[PDB]
Amino acid sequence: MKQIEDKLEEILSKLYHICNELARIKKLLGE
Amino acid sequence: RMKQIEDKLEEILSKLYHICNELARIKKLLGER
Amino acid sequence: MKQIEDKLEEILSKLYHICNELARIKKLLGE
Amino acid sequence: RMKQIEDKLEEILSKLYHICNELARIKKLLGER
Numbered sequence: 001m002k003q004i005e006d007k008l009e010e011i012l013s014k015l016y017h018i019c020n021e022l023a024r025i026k027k028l029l030g031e
Numbered sequence: 032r033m034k035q036i037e038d039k040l041e042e043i044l045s046k047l048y049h050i051c052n053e054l055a056r057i058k059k060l061l062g063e064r
Numbered sequence: 065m066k067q068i069e070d071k072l073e074e075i076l077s078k079l080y081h082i083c084n085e086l087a088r089i090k091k092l093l094g095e
Numbered sequence: 096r097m098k099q100i101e102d103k104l105e106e107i108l109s110k111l112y113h114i115c116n117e118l119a120r121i122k123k124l125l126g127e128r
Contacts (some may be wrong), residue, residue, distance in 0.1 A: 001061060008058040015051050017042060018107050022122055025100050026040040029033060029127055036089050043082050050075055059069055065125060072122040078113050084107060090104040093097060 001064060004124060005058055005116065008054060008061070008119065010053055011117060012051055012058070013108065014114060015047060017053070018110055019047050019051075021103060021107055022040055022044055022047075025103060026037055026044070027044050028038070028096070028100060029037055032092070039089060040084060043085055046078065046082055050078060053071065053075060057067060057071065060068060065128060069122055069125050072118060072125070076115055076122070078099055079111060079118070083111050083115075086108055086111075089106070090101055091118055092103055093104070
C-alpha cells in the first residue's frame with residue numbers, strides 16, 4: 001500500500017513536469 | 032487555426048490539473064488506510 | 065477501495081482522450 | 096523551431112503512455128486487495 005502511495009507521488013510530479021512543458025509550448029506557439 | 036491549437040492546449044492543461052487533484056485525493060485516501 | 069479502482073479507470077480514460085487531442089495537435093502542427 | 100515543438104509533443108505523448116501503464120498497474124494491484 002505504501003509502494004502505491006509513493007508511486008502516486010511520483011506520477012503527480014511527472015504530470016506536473018508535463019504540465020510545465022505544455023504551457024511552455026503554448027507560450028512559444030503564441031509568440 | 033493556430034489560435035484553436037492554443038485554446039485546446041489550455042483545455043488540456045486544465046484537464047490535467049483536474050487529474051492531478053483526483054490523483055492527490057487518492058494518494059491521501061490510501062495514506063488513511 | 066472499489067471507489068479508488070473505478071476512479072482510476074476513469075482517470076485512464078481521461079488520459080487517453082488527452083493523448084488523442086495532443087496527437088491531433090501534433091498532426092495539425094506538422095501540416 | 097516548430098519542429099522542436101512537435102518533437103516535444105512526441106516526448107509528452109510517450110511520457111503520458113508510461114503514466115497510463117503505471118496507473119493501470121496500480122488499478123490491478125488494488126483489485127487484488
